[PDB]
Design a protein that fits this description.
This is part of a larger assembly, with one copy of chain A and two copies of chain B.
Chain A (H helix, E strand, L loop, with lengths): L22 H6 L8 H8 L4
Chain B lengths: L22 E4 L10 H9 L6 E5 L21 H9 L3 E3 L5 E7 L5 E2 L9 E3 L5 E3 L8 E11 L29 E7 L15 E6 L5 H15 L8
Antiparallel strand pairs in B: 1-10, 2-8, 3-6, 4-8, 5-7, 9-10
The chains are: A mainly alpha, B alpha+beta.
PDB class: transcription/dna/rna
Keywords: transcription/DNA/RNA, DNA-dependent RNA polymerase, bacterial transcription, ternary elongation complex, antitermination, TRANSCRIPTION-DNA-RNA complex
Entry title: pseudo-atomic model of the RNA polymerase lambda-based antitermination complex solved by cryo-EM
Chain lengths: ~50, ~240, ~240
């Protein structure tokens, strides 16, 4: 519920999704900025 | 043609072993210096908003009138059942809209495998548990409606009147039409007859199940062929 | 066909007003969300190494035997004259090799307009000043030789013997066969009948003059059509 408030924006404390996969889908369409590199860093290096 | 030795006698050995409709290990060889990251990022650029799909638009339930009532004979509420119907992926070959027939009574956990099979509807996840049913004539029935869209449009501007003429009991549901879920790419090297410093760009593709990956990448391929005729004409 | 309303009733109004062979303002409309940067970068990816051209390979001068001699009646040296011949752009329609006839005596700054006109050779820059001539029978003559290539191959692996059989007086020159010099793209918006959020990708193209921009973008267009038949066959 922070996306319409002043607590969360498109670069401050927001994440509203279940998993890693479509968080970068939502992040690419200009709705999220942060915790996507923390979400994709958690699966790029430990996939191999 | 054959030309000179840059890439022309360099075939792209890109082959197929198919997993049905939801994930595919996509292999590629060979491409020269610095050709992995622009591949993954350009078809992450295309395959998130340029791809149409068929998702869940608006669901009718039985005598339960709105989302927050109760049904005699079910453990969970209707909001969690419809939440389980949001994640249900469905494939429609060539129909604009289709109504899915579902009915089951008695005790037994109703899954997505109880849906009546249509000639153009194929279920990718029959193992999806929706809700738990009990005794005392617990008859549940739903009418799943599938429409075509692309990407996310909210449920306040689309607003649809299927049963909003005088018999009511429907309300509009958020729809995620975007098929492509995840693409992850590995950037190891390859070798072919011409040159040695050639990159093997192995892809882990993930799709929800609305659009098949072969048809989606063929549509995105001919959309890409429609893209780069931009540098052509004068003025 | 007409289909549904995504892009099918959306014509691409891409039109022509031609500037002769060296620069072209390329206009484009309309393309939807996020379609400017992938256009500029994919046809920067193709149009730097995949394009053949006809550049300067090896030049014969008169009784001046090598690059660092002097000629009676000229101010500058032969190295600066050949440096001015490196930047000379030339168009060859359908010939493998051609020898350009040039001769001028007396006082007068010899430019590229003094070259004898051939039926398949057209000079794009007649205003190119090469060197300054003086009195006292300053007769200069050159034989410009044009060959076909693609991209940059150095002058130590190609090494050619035209006049390296017993009469000598030639040496191999570095050749930049790459026609496309600069493409800059502007990313303002467009509007057509179907949808509003559509990008107008206006291009400032620059070419040296070896290959015409229309033929180059048609060759790169059918090379692109040869590219994306990659996702087709099985195995």
């Amino acid at each position: 519920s922070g996306l319409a408030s002043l607590h969360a924006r498109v670069k401050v404390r927001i994440t509203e999704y279940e998993k890693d996969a479509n968080g970068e889908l939502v992040a690419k369409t200009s709705l999220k900025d942060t915790t996507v590199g923390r979400a994709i860093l958690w699966m790029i290096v430990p996939k191999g | 043609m054959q030309g000179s030795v840059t890439e022309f006698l360099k075939p792209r050995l890109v082959d197929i072993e198919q997993v049905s409709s939801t994930h595919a290990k996509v292999t590629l060889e060979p491409l020269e210096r610095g050709f992995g990251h622009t591949l993954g990022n350009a078809l992450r650029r295309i395959l998130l908003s340029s791809m149409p799909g068929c998702a869940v638009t608006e669901v009718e339930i039985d005598g339960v009138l709105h989302e927050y009532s109760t049904k005699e004979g079910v453990q969970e509420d209707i909001l969690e059942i419809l939440l389980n119907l949001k994640g249900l992926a469905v494939r429609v070959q060539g129909k604009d809209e289709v109504i899915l027939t579902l009915n089951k009574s008695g005790i037994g956990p109703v899954t997505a495998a109880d849906i009546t099979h249509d000639g153009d509807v194929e279920i990718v996840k029959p193992q999806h548990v929706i809700c738990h049913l009990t005794d005392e004539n617990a008859s549940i029935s739903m009418r799943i409606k599938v429409q075509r869209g692309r990407g996310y449009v909210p449920a306040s501007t689309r607003i649809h009147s299927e049963e909003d003429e005088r018999p009511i009991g429907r309300l509009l549901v958020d729809a995620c039409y975007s098929p492509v879920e995840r693409i992850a790419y590995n950037v190891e090297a390859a070798r072919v007859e011409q040159r040695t410093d050639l990159d093997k760009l192995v892809i882990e593709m993930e799709t929800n199940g609305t659009i098949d990956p072969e048809e989606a990448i063929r549509r995105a391929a001919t959309i890409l062929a429609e893209q780069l005729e931009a540098f052509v004409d004068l003025r």
